[PDB]
Design a protein around this nucleic acid. Structure first.
Length: 287
DNA sequence: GCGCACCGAAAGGTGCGTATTGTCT
């Protein structure tokens, strides 16, 4: 799954706390030609990440985005969240398979290359505006392992910073139209790449709809047992008498956000053991 | 969104809205 969120100034605390969560390679990581250009590679330094969120690109540069209207919100970035199918999360995190985690990381990286290809900006010459395709991004990727309900949930926040290097060498805000309008497509890339990676490791796949898949030897009941957030969303539709098969975007987001109950930081080593006990109870055979 | 209107004060740049399947930070 690929979901997206335009990030504003009021999200500065949420975005920096995407780093990096000591849990269970490297949990946080830079990607992009923009990033490479700025000398940014390997692990995301969280202090440098905050500066970049604020438009402070540094190294002898003006603060970006001073042309933002007072009546509008400052955009700090674009968050692309890649979430693996539940069976994949289960093999990766309950059974413990570093190869599956790697396969997820690669699917994300390759999808983000296609997102990057679609990076754009504007330039104005004499009141006439032109859209350029820049092809470069600065991205911080932060891998995470659990859902709101403490379920195994392999996902990566790819925070695309709101900056790109234009044709003239100038750094400017990202015109996000091609990435944002291509989310459905980019999600198919993630799925296709992940599936290819898992098949390369000898897993058999079972197919859903709209391109979704799961590992063949984990079934619906077993997946459902580890999908508490899904159950909460289903109950919400039932309570509102809504039909799960035909809901608006606005009603989807309502069910999603308002069905959230607040949970509390838990012993992470004790959590795996519970996952394993649960998988045993659900009869899951991890090969 | 092709421009608009207001940011800072470059006859330049920005958010705006976009858009979002299931596993559902």
């Amino acid at each position: 799954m690929l979901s997206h969120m335009v990030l504003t100034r009021q999200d500065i605390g949420r975005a920096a706390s995407y780093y990096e969560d000591g849990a269970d390679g490297d949990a946080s990581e830079w990607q992009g030609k923009g990033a490479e250009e700025l000398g940014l590679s390997g692990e995301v330094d969280s202090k440098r990440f905050r500066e970049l969120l604020a438009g402070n690109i540094g190294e002898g540069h003006r603060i970006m985005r001073s042309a933002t209207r007072q009546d509008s919100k400052e955009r700090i970035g674009l968050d692309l969240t890649f979430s693996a199918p539940k069976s994949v999360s289960l093999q990766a995190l309950v059974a413990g398979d570093a190869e599956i985690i790697k396969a997820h990381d690669r699917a994300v990286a390759r999808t983000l290359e296609q997102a990057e290809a679609r990076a754009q900006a504007r330039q104005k010459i004499q009141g006439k505006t032109r859209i350029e395709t820049t092809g470069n991004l600065v991205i911080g990727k932060f891998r995470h392992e659990t859902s709101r309900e403490r379920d195994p949930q392999l996902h990566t926040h790819a925070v695309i910073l709101n900056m790109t290097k234009r044709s003239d060498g100038q750094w400017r805000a990202l015109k996000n139209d091609e990435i944002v309008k291509a989310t459905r497509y980019l999600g198919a890339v993630y799925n296709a790449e992940l599936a290819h990676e898992l098949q390369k490791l000898g897993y058999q796949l079972r197919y859903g709809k709209d391109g979704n898949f799961d590992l063949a030897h984990i079934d619906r009941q077993q997946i459902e047992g580890f999908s508490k957030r899904t159950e909460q969303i289903a109950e919400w539709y039932a309570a509102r008498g809504l039909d799960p098969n035909s809901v608006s975007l606005e009603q989807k987001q309502a069910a999603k956000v308002l069905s959230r109950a607040k949970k509390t930081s838990v012993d992470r080593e004790a959590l795996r053991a519970e996952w394993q006990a649960t998988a045993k109870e659900l009869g899951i055979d991890f090969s």
